[PDB]
Amino acid sequence: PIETVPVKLKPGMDGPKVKQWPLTEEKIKALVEICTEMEKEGKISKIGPENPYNTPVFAIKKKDSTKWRKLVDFRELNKRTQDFWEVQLGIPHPAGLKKKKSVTVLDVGDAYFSVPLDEDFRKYTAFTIPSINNETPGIRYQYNVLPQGWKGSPAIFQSSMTKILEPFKKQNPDIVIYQYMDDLYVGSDLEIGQHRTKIEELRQHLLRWGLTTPGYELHPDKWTVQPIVLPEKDSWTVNDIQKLVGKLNWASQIYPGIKVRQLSKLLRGTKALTEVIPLTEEAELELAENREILKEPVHGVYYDPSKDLIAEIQKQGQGQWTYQIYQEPFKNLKTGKYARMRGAHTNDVKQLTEAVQKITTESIVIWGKTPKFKLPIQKETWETWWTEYWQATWIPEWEFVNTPPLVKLWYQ
Amino acid sequence: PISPIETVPVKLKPGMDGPKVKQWPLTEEKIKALVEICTEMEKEGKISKIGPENPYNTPVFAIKKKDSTKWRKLVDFRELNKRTQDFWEVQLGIPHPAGLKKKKSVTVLDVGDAYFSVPLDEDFRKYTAFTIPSINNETPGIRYQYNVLPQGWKGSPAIFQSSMTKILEPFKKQNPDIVIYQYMDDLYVGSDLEIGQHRTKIEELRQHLLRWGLTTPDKKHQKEPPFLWMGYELHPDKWTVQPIVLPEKDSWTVNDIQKLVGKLNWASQIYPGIKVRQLSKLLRGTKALTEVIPLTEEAELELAENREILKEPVHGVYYDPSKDLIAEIQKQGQGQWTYQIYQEPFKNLKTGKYARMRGAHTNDVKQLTEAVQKITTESIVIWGKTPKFKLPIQKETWETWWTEYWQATWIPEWEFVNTPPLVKLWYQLEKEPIVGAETFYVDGAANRETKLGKAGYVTNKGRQKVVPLTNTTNQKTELQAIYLALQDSGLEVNIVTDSQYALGIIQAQPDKSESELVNQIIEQLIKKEKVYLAWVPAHKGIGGNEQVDKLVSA
DNA sequence: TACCCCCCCTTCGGTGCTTTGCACCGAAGGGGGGG
Ligand SMILES: Cc1cn([C@H]2C[C@H](N=[N+]=[N-])[C@@H](COP(=O)(O)OP(=O)(O)OP(=O)(O)O)O2)c(=O)[nH]c1=O
C-alpha cells in the first residue's frame, strides 16, 4: 500500500524485445523455485503472450555465495529508461569514495521488493522461463514491485534509502555511502576491524527497516595504474630497435613528445635482424628523454560525466591481462594490469569474466558508471560460457573486437 | 453466446483499422467442401452471421489435409496480420526424442479441431469478417465473424499454446510424476505407472481436458508403440525418424537439389556422417529455381554414399539422466565436421554436423572450436547440461593454440581420442628472430587508378627482386611481396613487413582460405622449418623497409 | 497465393577497420521438419 511513481520510456522508443537464451538444468531449477516463492509473496505474477516485450533471465551465485540468486538482463530496458535515472531521479557521485582505504559492497536488492511498481510500467518487465528440451512452452512473468537489477529501481527507492541511512550517516558523519543499483557501497578510513563492525551496525540498522543482506571488500587506494614501459638491454639487436621504434611510434599518439629520429638513424641500413647495434650518443639520449616522458601524466585528461566510458582489454598470455579506461581515444582515464586471476593457466573465458567484473567495479567506485567493453573474443565463444562465471548483480554493455598484437604497447 | 475458457485481450497497431480486401476467385470444387463444414460451425457457436454493419473483408481458400481425404480451412489474413499487434511467441523451440527419458508406458493424443476450441476475444471478433462463395455468382453468401481462433491468423498459435498450459497447469500439479510434452495440440504423455493405472490417469486428463471443452478423438489417440510423434517413430527403448524419400529424378533442377539438401540435413540428425558440401556447391549464385543444372563428379559421389547410409536402418536411444553425456567429433575434410552424442558406447542419442565456413581465412582448430560451441548450445537445449568431449586433437596441440592466440578461447572438459585424421597446426611462427637465417625486407604498392603494382624485397645478403603486377590492389601486393620472400628463401627465413593487413591474416595460422594467393602462402609456410614474421611502421626511414619502399614505387 | 516455431546453405548489403579494399555479420529467401 504505497504510492507508485510513474515511469515513461525515452521519447519515441519501444520496450525491450529480447529473446531468451538456453539455460542449464541447475539454473532452470533455481529460477523456478525463486519464481514460485516470489509469486506466493505477490512479488511477481504470471502473464500471457499478449505482452510483446521480453527480457532475458538467468541465475548466478555471488562470489562464495553457494545460494542461487536471480538475475535479469535489463540492459535493453535500461537503455530505454535512460531519461529516468540520469536526468530526473539520479544520484550524485561521492568523489571521496575512491579515496577510502576500505569499501564494502552489500546486496540491498531484497528491499526493492517492498515498494510496488507503476502499473503502466509492469508491461516492460516481462521475462520468460524456458524449459529443458521444450517439454513445456515458456512460462512468462512480470514484476509487481521494484525489480532487482533495473536502473529505475535505486532511483525510486532513493528517498526511502536516504531516510534509512540518515541516522547512521549522522551517527558516523565522515563515512561515505554510495548506492549503485542492487549494491550499496560503504567506505571508511577506519581500521579493518572498526570498518567491518560499522557494517554489521549498518546491517542491523537496515534490518529494523525490513531488509536482509545475503560482504565484498575493496581497497581503492591500493589500486595501481599501469604505465607504458621501455625495455632494458645491455646490447640492442636490429629487431629489438625495430620493435622498439614501432612501439614508440604507436605511443606517440598519447605522449606527443616521443621522438624517433635518432633511433631511426640506427636502422638506416639493410641489416640482419639478429645483428647487434651499439647505440649512439643521441640515440641513448633520445631514449633517455623518451623514458622520462612516459613517466608523466597524459596532458589534458579528465572525466566528462556526459560521455560514455570505454574499456579495452588485451590478453597478454601466461595469466596476465591489461586494460585501459578512456572516453576519448588516447586520453586514458586509467590503465592497469591483472594477473593470477581465477582460472589462470586453464580457462580464458573465466579470467575475462573476472576482469570485466573487476574493471566495472573500479569504474563504479571512481566515476559511478559502467563502461562499454571492447572484448578480445569471438561472439559465439562469449555468449555461450559467460553466464557460468558471472558473479555480479549488474551486466555492462559490450562489443567484440579482433585486433592482433602488431605491437605490445601495454605489457612488455 | 456461451463461454468456455478464459480469453486473451487483443488489439490492433494503434491508429489503424481492419481488413478490407476482396475475395479470391475460388473454384467451385473447393466451395463444395467449403460451405459444408462452414455451415456446421454456426451450430456450435464457432462462427456467426453478421449484418453489413461489419465493413471488413478477407480472402479464403482451402487445402487438403496431408495423408487424408478431409479438407482444412485457411483464411488469408496477410493484410490483417500487417496491421495486427505484435506478440511474443511462447514456442521457444522443438522437443527432440533424444531428450526423452525412458518411460514405462506412453500415450500420444491429438486435439481435434485445436484452434477452434479456444474462444477469441469479444471486442476483436468483428475484424474476422469474410464472405463465403457460391456455385454461381448470383447468390451473395453469408458474411461471418469468427468466435474462435482462425487458421491463418498470426496470433492463433501463440494464444493456443499459452491457453493450453493454463488448462494443463492444475492437472500437472495434481500428477507431478506425469511427463506431458506439450507442443501445440500434440500431447506426449508418459509415466512410470503400470499400464493399467497409466491409461486410467490418461482418461482423467481426457476428462480434465473435456471439462474445458477440449476433444480427445480416439483416431488421433495412440495407445501402442511405435508412436508417431514429431515425425519420429518412438519405440519402448529406441526411436528413429520416419522414413526419408530421396527423389529419383534423372535430370535435376535447382528446386530438386534444394529438396535433396533439406532431406539430408533432416537425415543428418540420426544417420551418421551425412555430407552436403558438394551438393550445395551447385546452388551458388543461380538465378532460376526451375533452371536445370548438371551434377559434378564430386556431387555424384556424395549423393551415392549418402544413399548408402540411408540404405541400412538406424536408430537412437533415450536419455538416462544418471549417466554422463559424451560427444565425440570427427573431421570430414573441406571444413566439414560430424558428431555423435551418446551415453553408452556405440548406442547414439543423436548425431549432427557442423559445416559452416565462417570467414575468409580459417584453420581446423578455429572450426573445431566453432563446432564444440554449436554442440554445447544444442546440448544445453535438449538435456540442460554440457557433454564431456572426445576430440581428435592432441592435448598439447590445443594447449599451444589457446595460450598463444591473442583472443580468449576455451573448450570444456575433454579428452584426446586418437581417431585420425587428427587436427593440428600446420606451421608455427617463431617468437624470436632466427640466427643465421636470411632476413627479407618486403614491400608492395599498387596504383588506385592503374590497378598496376609492384612487389619485391631486399635482404642483408644483397639479394633482391621486384615483380610487375596486373589488376591488383594495395593489399594483394603486400601479400604477394611475402609470397616472393617465402619462395626465394631457405628453410629458415626472417621476413619484415610494414603491412598490418597481411601480418594479421598470417599470424592467425590459417590452413584454408578463399583467396588463392593466401593458399600459396600457406603452402610455402608448411614447407619451411622456421619462419619469423615482424612488423615495422612505414616511411620512418627504418631498415630495409625504406629501401624496398623505394624500389616498388618506381 | 495463410499462420507460428526450430535447423542448414546461399546471397546481399550494411558496418568499421584491415580502409575506400576487405572482412564480418545479420537479415532473408531457398529448402527440410513440427503443429
Ligand atoms: C497442419 C497445420 C496445422 N495448423 C494449426 C491449426 C490447427 N488448429 N486448428 N484448428 C492446429 C492443429 O492441427 P491438427 O492437429 O493437425 O488438426 P486439427 O485442425 O486440430 O483437427 P483434428 O484433425 O481433429 O485433430 O495446428 C495450421 O494453422 N496450418 C497447418 O497446415
Ligand SMILES: [Ca+2]
Ligand atoms: Ca488437431
